[PDB]
């Protein structure tokens, strides 16, 4: 029979795999739609949740009760040391989807960046990218690099830059830098490839990507709660006190 009264469903079906994230960082999964008309600009950045506080400002919203008034709004502090772009990835469009065409890593990879490649940095020989960086010196290696750049120029559709954070600027225990692919938008493929090449081994301060009083999107992994029952996991109704085999359950 029908349930005697209708009620909205508990929880969302858009987040059904209620599981621990397979990644600790939090991936983008969709970069903003690129157009060659805009100037070259990065589309993403990395930050660390420093803390929260509140501010006092005056609102300039006509027609509102709080127009030209003082409000107190909570804010969140996100420490963002400048990113260091250390590589370029070019992607090519296929009927099977986007796939990695060619990857070029810059010379002199930062020491904290090299820590990401090792599960045990303490026991490592620190051999990561040692033979790779030697091809930035020999003429045959530079010819190979230029050929890769030309292939990316004439074949790739979208390109992304590898950037890493700076643990030495942060008060965390972890010295392992955070790697990320960041999409480069706003121009022809050759223009953005050259622009990325001029920013290899360089620092990209957060102001160059995001500006004042603009609205952005935040991607992250929520606080872990461990194993939780239906009362907290789905905010279901608690059964009455008289219930025998438990009141923090779903009855049917």
């Amino acid at each position: 029979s029908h349930r005697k009264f209708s009620a909205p469903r508990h929880g969302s079906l858009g987040f059904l795999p209620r599981k621990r994230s397979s990644r600790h960082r939090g991936k983008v999964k969709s970069f903003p739609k690129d157009d060659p008309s805009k100037p070259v600009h990065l589309t993403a950045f990395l930050g660390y949740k420093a803390g929260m506080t509140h501010i006092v400002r005056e609102v300039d919203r006509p027609g509102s009760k709080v127009n030209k008034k003082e409000v107190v709004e909570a804010v969140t502090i996100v420490e963002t040391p400048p990113m260091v772009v250390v590589g370029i990835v070019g992607y090519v469009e296929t009927p099977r989807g986007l796939r990695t065409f060619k990857t070029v890593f810059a010379e002199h990879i930062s020491d904290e960046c090299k820590r990401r490649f090792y599960k045990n940095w303490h026991k490592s020989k620190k051999k990561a990218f040692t033979k790779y960086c030697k091809k930035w010196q020999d003429e045959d290696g530079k010819k190979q690099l230029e050929k890769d750049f030309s292939s990316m120029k004439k074949y790739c559709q979208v390109i992304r830059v590898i950037a890493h954070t700076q643990m030495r600027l942060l008060p965390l225990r972890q010295k392992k830098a955070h790697l990320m692919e960041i999409q480069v938008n706003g121009g022809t493929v050759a223009e953005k490839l050259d622009w990325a090449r001029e920013r290899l081994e360089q620092q990209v301060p957060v102001n160059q990507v995001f500006g004042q009083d603009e609205m952005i999107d935040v991607i992250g992994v929520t606080k872990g709660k461990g194993y939780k029952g239906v009362t907290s996991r789905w905010h279901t109704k608690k059964l009455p006190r008289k219930t025998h085999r438990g009141l923090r359950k779903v009855a049917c």
């Binding site: 469009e93 296929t94 009927p95 099977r96 989807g97």
Partner: protein, 201 residues
């Protein structure tokens, strides 16, 4: 046959070509189908779209993850259609099913090779001209396939390069006919032999 049979899906009907392919793979033959987005389906487009939406509605109510895997790519759709005509729950069916390869567009392993066309599945001869038909590429595009534009662009590039190859082959054939014209006093002895036995009208 022993070689790989390459079939062009353009202008071919779904059921007929699928039945022919399923009969072919059962005979221990390797079949590759390219440009599956060019497959036509009889009946007007709205009816076939309704059919595919009805297929979409059929899902396991308890757990849609275990449910019927609705494939959206035109090549994958044709692959599922062929799988419907085979005993794919048996080892023989799976072995036959592994002999079939389907692709959207024409891949580089096959774009430099000639493509067969099945008369018994062509829309031009198996459908009355006054009827309406539905393209597999458009139907897939409006139901959840995502790569129609890039497929069209790659097919455009392949058409450009194929036109270049065709012009080269026309130049070669013109030069061959010219060469046939240049030498015939040293050719007529064999020409009469060939013309005597039917070859070279």
């Amino acid at each position: 046959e022993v070689q790989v049979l390459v079939l062009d899906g353009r202008g071919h009907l779904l059921g007929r070509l699928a039945a022919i392919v399923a009969k072919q793979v059962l005979l221990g033959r390797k079949v590759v189908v390219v440009r599956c987005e060019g497959i036509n389906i009889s009946g007007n487009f709205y009816r076939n779209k309704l059919k595919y939406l009805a297929f979409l509605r059929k899902r396991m109510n308890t757990n849609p993850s275990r449910g019927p895997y609705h494939f959206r790519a035109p090549s994958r759709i044709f692959w599922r259609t062929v799988r419907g005509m085979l005993p794919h729950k048996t080892k023989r069916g799976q072995a036959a099913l592994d002999r079939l390869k389907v692709f959207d567009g024409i891949p580089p392993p096959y774009d430099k090779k000639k493509r067969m066309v099945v008369p018994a599945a062509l829309k031009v001869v198996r459908l009355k001209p006054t009827r309406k038909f539905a393209y597999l590429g458009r139907l897939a595009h409006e139901v959840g396939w995502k790569y129609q534009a890039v497929t069209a662009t790659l097919e455009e590039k392949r058409k450009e390069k194929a036109k270049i190859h065709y012009r080269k082959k026309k130049q070669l054939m013109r030069l061959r006919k010219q060469a046939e014209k240049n030498v015939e006093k040293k050719i007529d002895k064999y020409t009469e032999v060939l013309k005597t036995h039917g070859l070279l009208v």
